[PDB]
Amino acid sequence: ATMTSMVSQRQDLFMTDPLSPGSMFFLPNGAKIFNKLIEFMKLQQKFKFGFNEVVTPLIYKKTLWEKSGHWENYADDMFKVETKEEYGLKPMNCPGHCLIFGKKDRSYNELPLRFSDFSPLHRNEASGALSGLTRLRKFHQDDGHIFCTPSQVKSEIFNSLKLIDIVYNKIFPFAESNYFINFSTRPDHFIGDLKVWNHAEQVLKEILEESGKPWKLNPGDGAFYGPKLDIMVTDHLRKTHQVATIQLDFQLPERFDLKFKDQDNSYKRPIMIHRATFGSIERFMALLIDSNEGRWPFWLNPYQAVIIPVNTKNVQQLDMCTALQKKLRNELEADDMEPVPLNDWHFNVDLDIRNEPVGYRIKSAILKNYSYLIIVGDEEVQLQKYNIRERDNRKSFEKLTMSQIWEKFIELEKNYK
């Protein structure tokens, strides 16, 4: 029994199976949230923070991992693929993005060059370390790599902090006291020179102090390629978890011999910034469950609304419920050829017509954590209005029409509420 077990059971979110341990199954309801969080992050990355999404391979030749230093300094966590050339299943996206950078000639005008990647990653974690969605063998990162110049680093990290603030302080609050930063310094197994490393830590520390973010030193817990700014979120058992991370990399550009044409018409190395906001879609989703206990916001809820007729055998009530569900689900027939258009609204509304008392079905709804409960009795049929209430306030009853509820549910998603 873990951090997400009860809610996963109750809402049919995920599934494990001993034929692929450490990897897990997103059931239809669980996948909706997975896709919604990604959809959110893509919008922020593409239309506000200037990222360009790429899709990269999963397996690469051993020779690549030897460049990046993963093959030696990350051998404990890397899966190896075989069919006389040996391959590695990627635990990270960075080398693939380095190949992208080095494929063409790069101008200083292209910088900062930002790539994002939602590829599934594989890390051979120890069987004991495995735990729920927080630590998996397979997972997806909202990964991003920024190639920039020395004068662009400070502003790029601040931008990454802004997106982090929107996520952890505005959209998914768990102002301040939502997270603190671990200043993770040079580990025991590292690549590169100490001169470079000390410079890297100076730069990062200096930026860390301008941000004014709560922080503490986490000595010898950086990456083998660079020092990190690890966003730490605390759960209900007062245990911290690393989610978002900002990593300063002077090493991989040299390892891959990356270069760009600068203003002085000379070739210099780009500076590489590793960053993710969720960290992984899985772990971040696990920490949401730990805090909301299944009580999702409307825009994220797999159970957005349930319509409950008082008398399940009353045809008048049923027509009224059936109509609203059709309206809110907004779904076409497989009979014709009319395709589902883009940017249209579809809501996860259900219909409880089990032959059980209305009170039992309402209690059943609140247990499943439906964001809204819509009840239809005779008074509703007469008024042609639906008695809609909020999940977390049983005195939020109001009578709206089919149109009003439709427009209400839209204003909720356009406000991320």
| Chain residues in the site for ligand SSA (CB under 6 A) | 92-94, 123, 125, 135-136, 139, 141, 143, 242-243, 245, 274-276, 279-280, 282-283, 358-359, 362-363, 366, 375, 394
> Which listed residue (174, 180, 299, 406) binds a second copy by CB under 8 A?
299
| Phi and psi torsions of 157, nearest 5° | -70, -35
What distances in angstroms separate CA 138 from CA 55, 124, 381, one per listed residue? 17, 9, 50
Binding segment toward a second copy, per CB under 8 A, in 59-67, 192-200, 259-267, 384-392: 59-67
Cβ 17 to ligand SSA shortest distance, Å = 17
* CA atoms of 95 and 252, how far apart (whole Å): 8
Preceding-residue numbers of gaps in the chain (C–N over 2.5 Å): 83, 174
Residue 175 is a binding residue for a second copy (CB under 8 A): no
Cβ 79 to a second copy shortest distance, Å = 5
Sketch the per residue contact string, 71 through 110, with Zn ion: x for CB under 5 A, - otherwise: ---------------------x-x----------------
Question: 83 touches which of Zn ion, ligand SSA, a second copy, none (CB within 5 to 8 A by kind)?
Answer: a second copy
Task: Give the nearest residue (CB) to Zn ion.
Answer: 274
- Cβ neighbours of residue 301 closer than 8 Å, sequence gap 6 or more: 348, 369, 370, 371
Greatest pairwise CA separation for the chain in angstroms? 81
Residue 35 is a binding residue for a second copy (CB under 8 A): yes
Among all chains, which residue has been given the structure tokens 């100490």?
A: 194
Residue 217 is a binding residue for a second copy (CB under 8 A): no
Give catalytic status of residue 228 as yes or no. Answer: yes
Cβ 221 to ligand SSA shortest distance, Å = 10
Give catalytic status of residue 236 as yes or no. Answer: no
* CA atoms of 254 and 236, how far apart (whole Å): 42
State the burial class of residue 34 (Cβ atoms within 10 Å of its Cβ: 0-12, 13-18, 19+).
middle
Residue 274 is a binding residue for Zn ion (CB under 5 A): yes
Residue of 123, 283, 368, 385 marked active site: 123
Cβ distance 108 to 260 under 8 Å?
yes
Q: Which of 217, 227, 219 is nearest to 191 (CA)?
A: 227
Point out which residues bind Zn ion (CB under 5 A). Answer: 92, 94, 274
Active-site positions read 94, 123, 141, 143, 145, 228, 274
